[PDB]
Structure 1
Amino acid sequence: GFKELIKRDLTTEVGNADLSKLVENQIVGHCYRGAFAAVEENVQEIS
């Protein structure tokens, strides 16, 4: 009942830079993911 949905696992792309300030490219991470949980599978306990 648990499904892991992935389109892009991870993509660290160098971002736009303001050359007029001499600021380096914005390193930015990005992941397009999702999950599908359930209740039929799981049972809680105590201690």
Structure 2
Amino acid sequence: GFKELIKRDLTTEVGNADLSKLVENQIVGHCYRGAFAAVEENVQEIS
């Protein structure tokens, strides 16, 4: 009942530096993923 969708893992890219202010490139990471879960598989315990 549990499935992991991985279109793309972590991917870091750098850009959008503003030379007019001497600010360095915006370092940005992104990820494409999805998780499918269910209550049909679980029982929740106490202690």
Shorter-chain TM-score: what band? 0.7 to 0.9
Give the paired residue count. 47
**Equivalent residue, structure 1, for 2:31:** 31
Q: CA RMSD in A?
A: 0.8
Q: Secondary structure, in 3 states, of the residue corresponding to 1:32?
A: strand
Q: Which structure is higher in strand share? A: 2
Give identity over the alignment, percent.
Answer: 100
**Equivalent residue, structure 1, for 2:22:** 22
Off by >3 Å, runs of 4+ in structure 1: none
Q: TM-score, normalised by structure 1?
A: 0.88
Query: What are the ranges of 5 or more consecutive residues in structure 1 without an aligned counterpart?
Result: none
